[PDB]
Amino acid sequence: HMTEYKLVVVGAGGVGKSALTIQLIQNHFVDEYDEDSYRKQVVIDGETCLLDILDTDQYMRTGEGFLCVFAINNTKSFEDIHHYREQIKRVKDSEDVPMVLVGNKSDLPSRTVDTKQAQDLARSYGIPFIETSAKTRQGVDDAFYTLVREIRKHKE
Ligand SMILES: Nc1nc2c(ncn2[C@@H]2O[C@H](COP(=O)(O)OP(=O)(O)OP(=O)(O)O)[C@@H](O)[C@H]2O)c(=O)[nH]1
Ligand SMILES: [Mg+2]
């Protein structure tokens, strides 16, 4: 009676992958954290979805959609997005994998990646860009829901 979506959250260490997932799962922001996956049931456009979420193998090759996360005060995390996308394109053998680019930590003032750099990168890949804060919860639902919608756009 519900539809499963297998989602994988990738990106450089420290960008807030666990925090974003924990925000989705328990509606709270964890300052310090620690080895498995999470399930969440959520209605998205009138469909009961069971999200199966891996934070950071089986999931990489069977994942249906990817959140590619960098932090907006970590220029290197942003630069490394290319490596994460090439990896995904390799291990799914397609140039057209459901994916959302997420720029996390928007609450922080120390901002070294501009919204234009990020908009440019996402436009080049043909994917949505969503800005988030795991701390304030801004954008978190939006990122996961938009990923579900990209998966649907691609396959039944
Ligand atoms: N201010 C702020 N801090 C955040 C945010 N997201 C995560 N952090 C902090 O950044 C640090 C790293 O967050 P994690 O979720 O552990 O990062 P991760 O990407 O899962 O790191 P790995 O699991 O090592 O790959 C932690 O101290 C978090 O509290 C955010 O949106 N805003
Ligand atoms: Mg993590």
State the residue for tokens 């959250």. Answer: 9
Ligand 1 lined by 107 (C-beta under 6 Å): yes
- How far is residue 61's CA from residue 89's CA, in Å, rounded to a whole number? 10
- Residue 115 contacts residue 131 (beta carbons within 8 Å): yes
- How far is residue 32's CA from residue 38's CA, in Å, rounded to a whole number? 18
- Residue 105 contacts residue 73 (beta carbons within 8 Å): yes
The experimental method behind these coordinates is: X-ray
Rounded (5°) CA angle 33-14-105: 100
Domain range for 66: 1-156
Laid out side by side, the sheet with 65-71 consists of 37-44, 47-55, 3-10, 65-71, 99-104, 129-131
Q: Report the nearest atom of ligand 1 relative to the CA of 108.
A: 1
- How far is residue 120's CA from residue 110's CA, in Å, rounded to a whole number? 20
- Count of domains forming the chain: 1
Ligand 1 lined by 103 (C-beta under 6 Å): no
Q: What is the distance in A from the centroid of ligand 2 to the CA of 136?
A: 18
Three-state DSSP class for 66? Answer: strand
Going by C-beta distance under 8 Å and a sequence separation of 6 or more, which residues neighbour residue 34? 18
| CATH number assigned to the domain comprising residue 98 | 3.40.50.300
- Residue 113 contacts residue 122 (beta carbons within 8 Å): no
Ligand 1 lined by 22 (C-beta under 6 Å): no
Q: Which segments of the chain are extended strands (E)? A: 3-10, 37-44, 47-55, 65-71, 99-104, 129-131
- How far is residue 97's CA from residue 153's CA, in Å, rounded to a whole number? 11
- Exposed, middle or buried by CB within 10 Å (0-12, 13-18, 19+), for 121? buried
Q: Which two tokens stand for residue 18?
A: 């666990």
Q: Report the nearest atom of ligand 1 relative to the CA of 11.
A: 19
- From the CA of 32, which ligand is nearest? 1
Cα 155 to Cα 9, 10, 41, 97, 152: the distances in Å are: 20, 21, 20, 10, 5
If one residue of 34, 105, 110 were mutated to test the ligand 1 pocket, choosing by the most ligand atoms within 8 A of its CB, it would be 105
Buried/exposed code over 6-18 (b: 16+ C-beta within 10 A; e: otherwise): bbbbbbbeebbbb
